[PDB]
Design a protein around this ligand. Structure first.
Ligand code: CA
Ligand code: CA
Length: 675
């Protein structure tokens, strides 16, 4: 189904303007006019065609060839003419390069009815079976047997003219047509316009060709958007820690004593470090939940983790090595996983192990040779004081599942490594980081011109508006670019120093003053670094959402579904719920004196997301599993939110553990008689 010959149909007489580039599984190289719907009938007359590929006999013999129009054809087997009706020998299990040309001046009908025949020695003629036909070797190199030799400079298969003018693909039966882009026909039909470098086998410089992507001849786990010739396909990996277990460690000086243990959940964001940076390292920051021995001791931690692949291509036989770090640069541990011994793939937008299996332990329960992770006394304090650890991760991703034109299958290829590709990718694409998803930093990379390197000239022009559409799924339902119903203007822009001077020089040249209104005209360059973030939120130096504007947070808590002396039951937006680290509840008597119910910095965890997706705030938790006692219907019940960034994680210098001084935000206030 994936094999057969490759065919170029031209509407002119000499293979100049190709109308269709497609493959046929058998010697039936016909295209019926009814599959030429997305070509005007002005073009459906083909004056010439070229086919190329290989034939493989399954039984040695003396074969004769012939076509449906021998008076219009010239056929070659191994650069040896055979048509212009004779005989030739073909040894078993050995491939033969075939090229067939066809020219008919002024066809009287649309499409092409053409068939390729061979006759064996027992004198049975036939349309050639599928199992005897194979595609050209459309790679950058040659395999031992398949030699590759209609301008196709990079040899991806898509002719040069089509890569430059534009082209689309239409999924016919199961077979794919590739045609020039015609404004009035495909604009109506909503088809995608494609452009790509006729000099780059792969225009984003990754492991899949511009032809492999747009025809489906590609690993099935590549993200839907990396199937675009201009959107790079690469893994991107960080480690997510989920919870942690600290312990008093076994001193060499009675091991039946009681247990001493701290077990808290954690949260891990993938980071970026700024004005965007040029770094391509993988890294994530872990925050340890802060709420409910002697100077010569040592403690040790265990934790559950999963790899996260937020890129656009799969990893198969290697997971990257990781450093668990404390403070600035004290590696406490290394985290490797055995090569070629993975229990599954790590797919894009996906975990390892998959969210349905259990996560990985750092010291597996069954594994004799896992290193105890250890801190000394002062390191432990550094950790209690920061409740933050870091996870740096290299880009060693291992081998690549590439496509094989000989058998038409996609297999892990031990000659392909990701380390041979990442550098070429990073050098020739603009990069966008966008957190519109879940306030999570997602990277993508789009082919862009480099106006100082001669090759990148032949690459397509890439506007900023287009990059957002094809790389992130922004669309414009009414001449208004948006991402899932949020207008583009709700996200801000940031750039590294160089990109920023570039874009500014561009606006000046367009005499434009506001970027949002000339996105379709801002161009991208290789090595550009663009950050893009939700305007509602405040971000730390790692570009992690750690707060919001008070008014944003108040409006968010305006929809109060219900309330009582046991709690409030609100409808808070998922994104907001993500940057609040707790709530304070107080009963304010009538003289303005305030009594705080859960008056402690480690007791603000009273929120919780009920099944239906609504939030509930538990007054009973730190009030003795009771409801609130309001001894006067005029007394007020106040409730505040604390954002992640205003949450304090230790007692103060002087030793205060109250919520006194915490920066709160009033989100609800009612009287006793209104509850
Ligand atoms: Ca080409
Ligand atoms: Ca190309």
């Amino acid at each position: 189904s994936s094999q057969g010959l490759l065919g170029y149909y031209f509407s002119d007489l000499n293979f100049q303007a190709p109308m269709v580039v497609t493959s046929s599984t058998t010697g039936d190289l016909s295209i019926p006019s009814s599959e030429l719907e997305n070509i005007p009938s002005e073009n459906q007359y083909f004056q010439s065609a070229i086919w190329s590929g290989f034939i493989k006999v399954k039984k040695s013999d003396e074969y004769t060839f012939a076509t449906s129009a021998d008076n219009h054809v010239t056929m070659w087997v191994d650069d040896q003419e055979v048509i212009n009706s004779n005989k030739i020998r073909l040894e078993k299990g050995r491939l033969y390069q075939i090229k067939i040309q066809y020219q008919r001046e002024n066809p009287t009908e649309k499409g092409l009815d053409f068939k390729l025949y061979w006759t064996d020695s027992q004198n049975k003629k036939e349309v050639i079976s599928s199992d005897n036909l194979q595609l050209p070797e459309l790679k950058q190199k040659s395999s031992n047997s398949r030699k590759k030799r209609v301008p196709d400079r990079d040899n991806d298969g898509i002719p040069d003219s089509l890569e430059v003018e534009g082209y689309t693909v239409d999924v016919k039966n199961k077979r794919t047509f590739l045609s020039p882009w015609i404004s009035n026909i495909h604009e109506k039909k909503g088809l995608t316009k494609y452009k790509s470098s006729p000099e780059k086998w792969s225009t984003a410089s990754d492991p899949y060709s511009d032809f492999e992507k747009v025809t489906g001849r590609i690993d099935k786990n590549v993200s839907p958007e990396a199937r675009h010739p201009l959107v790079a396909a690469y893994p991107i990996v960080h480690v997510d820690m989920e919870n942690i277990i600290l312990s008093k460690n076994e001193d060499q000086s009675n091991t039946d004593s009681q247990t001493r243990t701290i077990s808290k959940n954690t949260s891990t964001s993938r980071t970026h470090t700024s004005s965007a940076g040029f770094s391509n390292s993988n890294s994530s920051t872990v925050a340890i939940d802060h709420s409910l021995l002697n100077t010569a001791d040592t403690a040790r931690l265990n934790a559950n983790i999963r790899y996260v692949n937020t890129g656009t291509a799969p990893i198969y036989n290697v997971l990257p090595t990781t450093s668990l770090v404390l403070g600035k640069n004290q590696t406490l541990a290394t985290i490797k996983a055995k090569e070629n011994q993975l229990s599954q793939i790590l797919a894009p937008n996906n975990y390892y192990p998959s969210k349905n299996l259990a996560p990985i332990a750092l010291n597996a329960q069954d594994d004799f040779s896992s290193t105890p992770i250890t801190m000394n006394y002062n390191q432990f304090l550094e950790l209690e004081k920061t409740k933050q650890l870091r996870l740096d991760t290299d880009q060693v991703y291992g081998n690549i599942a590439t496509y094989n034109f000989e058998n038409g299958r996609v297999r892990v290829d031990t000659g392909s490594n990701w380390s041979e590709v990442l550098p070429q990718i990073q050098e020739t694409t603009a990069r966008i980081i966008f957190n519109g998803k879940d306030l999570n930093l997602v990277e993508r990379r789009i082919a862009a011109v480099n106006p100082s390197d001669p090759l990148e000239t032949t690459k397509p022009d890439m506007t900023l508006k287009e990059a957002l559409k094809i790389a992130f799924g922004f669309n414009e339902p009414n001449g208004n670019l948006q991402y899932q119903g949020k207008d583009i203007t709700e996200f801000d822009f940031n750039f590294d120093q160089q990109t920023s001077q570039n874009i500014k020089n561009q606006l000046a040249e367009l005499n434009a003053t506001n970027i949002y209104t000339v996105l379709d005209k801002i161009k991208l360059n290789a090595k550009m670094n663009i950050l893009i973030r939700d305007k509602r939120f405040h971000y730390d130096r790692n570009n992690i959402a750690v707060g919001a504007d008070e008014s944003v947070v108040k409006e968010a808590h305006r929809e109060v579904i219900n309330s009582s002396t046991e709690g409030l039951l609100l409808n808070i937006d998922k994104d907001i719920r993500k940057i609040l680290s707790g709530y304070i509840v107080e009963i304010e008597d009538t003289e303005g004196l305030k009594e705080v119910i859960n008056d402690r910095y480690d007791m603000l965890n009273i929120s919780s997301l009920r099944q239906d997706g609504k939030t509930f705030i538990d007054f009973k938790k730190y009030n003795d599993k009771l409801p609130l006692y309001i001894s006067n219907p005029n007394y007020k019940v106040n409730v505040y939110a604390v954002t992640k960034e205003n949450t304090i994680i230790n007692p103060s210098e002087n030793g205060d553990t109250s919520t006194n001084g915490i920066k709160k935000i009033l989100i609800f206030s009612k009287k006793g008689y209104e509850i």
